[PDB]
Amino acid sequence: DAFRLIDTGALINNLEPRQTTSNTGLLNKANIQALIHGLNRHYYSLNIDYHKTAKETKMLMNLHKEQWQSGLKMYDYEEKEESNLAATKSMVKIAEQYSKRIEEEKELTEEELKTRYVGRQDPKKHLSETADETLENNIVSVLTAGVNSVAIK
Amino acid sequence: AIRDEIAKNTELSYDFLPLSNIKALLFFNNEKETEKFALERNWPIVNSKVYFNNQSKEKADYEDEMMHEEDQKTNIIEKAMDYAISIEN
């Protein structure tokens, strides 16, 4: 947030509002919606952007990802993920156990194929829970398994 | 052609067999001619015995990344894991 005074003057100049999403006041809603017209004074209409040089943009792209394991990904998370792989194998089995039990009760209670059920989208939610979760658990056991050994000699 | 077909069976079915039996099984009239057939078939010959070291097979025209490869075994295992990812993508 910012503030800038206007009072008398500041007119007979270039176009302040036309820049970014100004000329507003549908209902009272803008920003914090405690403002409407006056805001602090006159609706200075802040515009917040950012610009950086070629050196600054090159940094945060490669530097900032999640945390720093970088420069070698092989052995840093290898021992940590492999040690919990025995427990992960047992935890992913429970997720599959509750998968088909939802789809089994889904088609068992519907003999109609109409909507009295306020079920407007029933299947896609539970279908994605059995898909996206399955799609999440298998890819982390494959893509990581390729670099989990890579021993050669 | 029958004796050549039997020779393919005698490799796997006989680990060690003497010289006198090969003459009787394949119906040979000479013992010296019996050893001559073993030279063209690459059969090791020792005293009163004939072994087979040729049970292991290789070559057979040209093959790459198929049918028990050699130096690509480590890569193909990792390649098969990367093929299913692109099918979904």
Side-chain angles (χ1 to χ4, degrees), chain A residues 10 20 22 26 42 52-53 68 71 82 87 94 103-104 111 117 120-121 123 125 131-133 137 141-142 149:
Chain A
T20 300
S22 178
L26 187 148
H42 295 82
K52 295 176 180 177
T53 59
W68 288 89
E82 185 68 14
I94 296 170
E103 294 177 351
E104 183 178 2
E111 296 302 321
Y117 179 75
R120 295 181 182 175
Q121 184 65 259
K125 184 179 296 298
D132 290 344
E133 294 178 351
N137 295 132
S141 178
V142 173
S149 63

CSV table of all heavy atoms in Angstrom, one decimal, chain A residues 10 20 22 26 42 52-53 68 71 82 87 94 103-104 111 117 120-121 123 125 131-133 137 141-142 149:
chain,number,residue,atom,x,y,z
A,10,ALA,N,-2.5,19.2,-9.6
A,10,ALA,CA,-2.2,17.9,-10.1
A,10,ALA,C,-3.0,17.5,-11.3
A,10,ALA,O,-2.8,16.4,-11.9
A,10,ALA,CB,-2.3,16.8,-9.0
A,20,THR,N,-3.5,1.5,-15.1
A,20,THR,CA,-3.8,0.2,-14.7
A,20,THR,C,-5.1,0.1,-13.9
A,20,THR,O,-5.2,0.7,-12.9
A,20,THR,CB,-2.6,-0.3,-13.8
A,20,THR,OG1,-1.4,-0.4,-14.6
A,20,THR,CG2,-2.9,-1.8,-13.3
A,22,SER,N,-7.9,1.4,-13.4
A,22,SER,CA,-8.6,2.4,-12.7
A,22,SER,C,-9.9,2.7,-13.4
A,22,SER,O,-10.4,1.9,-14.2
A,22,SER,CB,-7.7,3.7,-12.6
A,22,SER,OG,-8.4,4.7,-12.0
A,26,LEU,N,-17.5,0.1,-9.2
A,26,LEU,CA,-18.7,-0.8,-9.3
A,26,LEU,C,-19.0,-1.2,-7.8
A,26,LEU,O,-18.1,-1.7,-7.1
A,26,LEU,CB,-18.4,-2.0,-10.1
A,26,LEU,CG,-19.5,-3.0,-10.4
A,26,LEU,CD1,-19.2,-3.7,-11.8
A,26,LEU,CD2,-19.5,-4.1,-9.4
A,42,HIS,N,-8.2,11.3,-2.7
A,42,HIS,CA,-8.3,11.4,-4.2
A,42,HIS,C,-8.1,10.2,-5.0
A,42,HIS,O,-8.1,10.2,-6.2
A,42,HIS,CB,-7.4,12.5,-4.7
A,42,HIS,CG,-7.7,13.9,-4.2
A,42,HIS,ND1,-7.3,14.4,-3.0
A,42,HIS,CD2,-8.4,14.9,-4.8
A,42,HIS,CE1,-7.8,15.6,-2.8
A,42,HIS,NE2,-8.5,15.9,-3.9
A,52,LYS,N,14.0,-6.0,-13.5
A,52,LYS,CA,15.3,-6.3,-13.1
A,52,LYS,C,16.2,-6.4,-14.3
A,52,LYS,O,15.8,-6.5,-15.4
A,52,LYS,CB,15.4,-7.7,-12.3
A,52,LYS,CG,14.6,-7.6,-11.0
A,52,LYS,CD,14.6,-9.0,-10.3
A,52,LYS,CE,13.9,-8.9,-9.0
A,52,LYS,NZ,13.8,-10.2,-8.4
A,53,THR,N,17.5,-6.4,-14.1
A,53,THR,CA,18.5,-6.5,-15.1
A,53,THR,C,18.7,-8.0,-15.5
A,53,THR,O,18.1,-8.9,-15.0
A,53,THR,CB,19.9,-5.9,-14.7
A,53,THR,OG1,20.3,-6.6,-13.5
A,53,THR,CG2,19.7,-4.4,-14.4
A,68,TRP,N,18.1,-26.1,-0.9
A,68,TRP,CA,19.4,-26.3,-1.6
A,68,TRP,C,19.9,-27.7,-1.3
A,68,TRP,O,20.5,-28.0,-0.3
A,68,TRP,CB,20.4,-25.2,-1.1
A,68,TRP,CG,20.1,-23.9,-1.6
A,68,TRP,CD1,19.3,-22.9,-1.0
A,68,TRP,CD2,20.7,-23.3,-2.8
A,68,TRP,NE1,19.3,-21.8,-1.8
A,68,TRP,CE2,20.1,-22.0,-2.9
A,68,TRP,CE3,21.5,-23.7,-3.8
A,68,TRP,CZ2,20.4,-21.1,-4.0
A,68,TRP,CZ3,21.8,-22.9,-4.9
A,68,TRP,CH2,21.3,-21.6,-4.9
A,71,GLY,N,23.4,-28.9,-7.4
A,71,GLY,CA,24.7,-29.1,-8.0
A,71,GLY,C,25.0,-30.6,-8.1
A,71,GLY,O,25.6,-31.0,-9.1
A,82,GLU,N,15.6,-43.5,0.6
A,82,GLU,CA,15.7,-45.0,0.6
A,82,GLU,C,15.4,-45.5,2.0
A,82,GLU,O,14.9,-46.6,2.1
A,82,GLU,CB,17.0,-45.4,0.1
A,82,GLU,CG,17.2,-47.0,-0.1
A,82,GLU,CD,16.3,-47.6,-1.1
A,82,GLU,OE1,15.8,-46.8,-2.0
A,82,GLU,OE2,16.2,-48.8,-1.2
A,87,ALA,N,9.0,-47.9,4.9
A,87,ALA,CA,7.7,-47.4,5.4
A,87,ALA,C,6.8,-46.8,4.4
A,87,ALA,O,5.6,-46.8,4.5
A,87,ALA,CB,8.0,-46.3,6.5
A,94,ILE,N,-2.1,-48.6,2.0
A,94,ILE,CA,-3.4,-48.2,2.6
A,94,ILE,C,-4.2,-47.3,1.7
A,94,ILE,O,-5.4,-47.4,1.7
A,94,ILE,CB,-3.1,-47.6,4.0
A,94,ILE,CG1,-2.4,-48.6,4.9
A,94,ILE,CG2,-4.4,-47.0,4.6
A,94,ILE,CD1,-1.9,-48.0,6.2
A,103,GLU,N,-15.4,-46.6,-4.9
A,103,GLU,CA,-16.0,-46.9,-6.1
A,103,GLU,C,-17.0,-48.0,-6.0
A,103,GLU,O,-18.0,-48.1,-6.8
A,103,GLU,CB,-15.0,-47.2,-7.2
A,103,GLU,CG,-14.1,-46.0,-7.6
A,103,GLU,CD,-13.0,-46.3,-8.6
A,103,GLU,OE1,-12.9,-47.5,-8.9
A,103,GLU,OE2,-12.4,-45.4,-9.1
A,104,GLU,N,-16.8,-49.0,-5.1
A,104,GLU,CA,-17.7,-50.1,-4.9
A,104,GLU,C,-19.0,-49.6,-4.3
A,104,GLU,O,-20.1,-50.0,-4.8
A,104,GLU,CB,-17.0,-51.1,-4.0
A,104,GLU,CG,-17.9,-52.4,-3.8
A,104,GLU,CD,-17.2,-53.4,-2.9
A,104,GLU,OE1,-16.1,-53.2,-2.5
A,104,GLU,OE2,-17.8,-54.5,-2.7
A,111,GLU,N,-29.2,-47.3,-8.7
A,111,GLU,CA,-29.9,-48.0,-9.8
A,111,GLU,C,-30.6,-47.2,-10.8
A,111,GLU,O,-31.2,-47.7,-11.7
A,111,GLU,CB,-30.9,-49.0,-9.1
A,111,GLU,CG,-30.3,-50.1,-8.2
A,111,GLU,CD,-29.2,-50.9,-9.0
A,111,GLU,OE1,-29.5,-51.3,-10.2
A,111,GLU,OE2,-28.2,-51.3,-8.4
A,117,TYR,N,-29.8,-37.1,-6.3
A,117,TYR,CA,-28.7,-37.4,-5.3
A,117,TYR,C,-27.9,-36.1,-4.9
A,117,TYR,O,-26.9,-36.3,-4.2
A,117,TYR,CB,-27.9,-38.5,-5.9
A,117,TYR,CG,-26.7,-38.9,-5.0
A,117,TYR,CD1,-26.9,-39.7,-3.9
A,117,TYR,CD2,-25.4,-38.6,-5.4
A,117,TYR,CE1,-25.8,-40.1,-3.1
A,117,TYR,CE2,-24.3,-39.0,-4.7
A,117,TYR,CZ,-24.5,-39.8,-3.5
A,117,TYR,OH,-23.4,-40.2,-2.8
A,120,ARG,N,-24.1,-33.7,-8.4
A,120,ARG,CA,-23.9,-33.1,-9.7
A,120,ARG,C,-22.7,-33.5,-10.5
A,120,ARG,O,-22.7,-33.9,-11.6
A,120,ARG,CB,-24.0,-31.5,-9.6
A,120,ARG,CG,-25.3,-31.0,-9.1
A,120,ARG,CD,-25.3,-29.5,-9.0
A,120,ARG,NE,-26.5,-28.9,-8.5
A,120,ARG,CZ,-26.8,-27.7,-8.2
A,120,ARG,NH1,-25.8,-26.8,-8.4
A,120,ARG,NH2,-27.9,-27.3,-7.7
A,121,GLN,N,-21.5,-33.4,-9.8
A,121,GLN,CA,-20.4,-34.3,-10.2
A,121,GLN,C,-20.1,-35.2,-9.0
A,121,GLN,O,-19.4,-34.8,-8.1
A,121,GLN,CB,-19.2,-33.4,-10.6
A,121,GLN,CG,-18.0,-34.2,-11.1
A,121,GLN,CD,-18.3,-34.9,-12.4
A,121,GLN,OE1,-18.6,-36.1,-12.5
A,121,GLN,NE2,-18.3,-34.1,-13.5
A,123,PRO,N,-18.8,-38.7,-9.8
A,123,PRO,CA,-17.7,-39.6,-10.1
A,123,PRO,C,-16.3,-38.9,-10.2
A,123,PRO,O,-15.3,-39.5,-9.6
A,123,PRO,CB,-18.1,-40.2,-11.5
A,123,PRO,CG,-19.5,-40.0,-11.5
A,123,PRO,CD,-19.7,-38.6,-10.9
A,125,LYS,N,-14.7,-36.6,-8.8
A,125,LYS,CA,-14.0,-36.3,-7.5
A,125,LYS,C,-13.3,-37.6,-7.0
A,125,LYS,O,-12.1,-37.6,-6.8
A,125,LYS,CB,-14.9,-35.7,-6.5
A,125,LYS,CG,-14.2,-35.4,-5.2
A,125,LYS,CD,-15.2,-34.8,-4.2
A,125,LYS,CE,-15.8,-33.5,-4.7
A,125,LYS,NZ,-14.7,-32.4,-4.9
A,131,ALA,N,-7.0,-41.7,-9.1
A,131,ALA,CA,-6.1,-41.5,-10.2
A,131,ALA,C,-4.9,-40.6,-9.9
A,131,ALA,O,-3.7,-41.1,-9.9
A,131,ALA,CB,-6.9,-40.9,-11.4
A,132,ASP,N,-5.2,-39.4,-9.5
A,132,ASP,CA,-4.1,-38.4,-9.2
A,132,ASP,C,-3.2,-39.0,-8.1
A,132,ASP,O,-2.0,-38.8,-8.1
A,132,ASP,CB,-4.6,-37.1,-8.8
A,132,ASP,CG,-5.2,-36.4,-10.0
A,132,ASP,OD1,-5.0,-36.8,-11.2
A,132,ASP,OD2,-6.0,-35.4,-9.8
A,133,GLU,N,-3.8,-39.6,-7.0
A,133,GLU,CA,-3.0,-40.2,-6.0
A,133,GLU,C,-2.2,-41.4,-6.5
A,133,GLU,O,-1.0,-41.5,-6.1
A,133,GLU,CB,-3.9,-40.6,-4.8
A,133,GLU,CG,-4.5,-39.4,-4.1
A,133,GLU,CD,-5.5,-39.9,-3.0
A,133,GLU,OE1,-5.7,-41.1,-2.9
A,133,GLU,OE2,-5.9,-39.0,-2.2
A,137,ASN,N,1.9,-41.5,-6.6
A,137,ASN,CA,2.7,-42.5,-5.9
A,137,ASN,C,3.6,-43.3,-6.8
A,137,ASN,O,4.7,-43.8,-6.4
A,137,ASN,CB,1.8,-43.5,-5.1
A,137,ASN,CG,1.0,-42.8,-4.0
A,137,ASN,OD1,-0.2,-42.9,-3.8
A,137,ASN,ND2,1.7,-42.0,-3.2
A,141,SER,N,8.2,-43.4,-7.3
A,141,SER,CA,8.9,-44.7,-7.1
A,141,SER,C,9.6,-45.1,-8.4
A,141,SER,O,10.2,-46.2,-8.5
A,141,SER,CB,7.9,-45.7,-6.7
A,141,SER,OG,8.5,-47.0,-6.6
A,142,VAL,N,9.5,-44.3,-9.5
A,142,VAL,CA,10.1,-44.6,-10.8
A,142,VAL,C,11.2,-43.6,-11.1
A,142,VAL,O,12.4,-43.9,-11.2
A,142,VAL,CB,9.1,-44.7,-11.9
A,142,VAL,CG1,9.8,-44.8,-13.2
A,142,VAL,CG2,8.1,-45.8,-11.6
A,149,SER,N,20.0,-45.8,-7.9
A,149,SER,CA,21.2,-46.7,-8.0
A,149,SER,C,22.3,-46.0,-8.8
A,149,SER,O,23.3,-45.5,-8.3
A,149,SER,CB,20.8,-48.0,-8.6
A,149,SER,OG,20.4,-47.9,-9.9
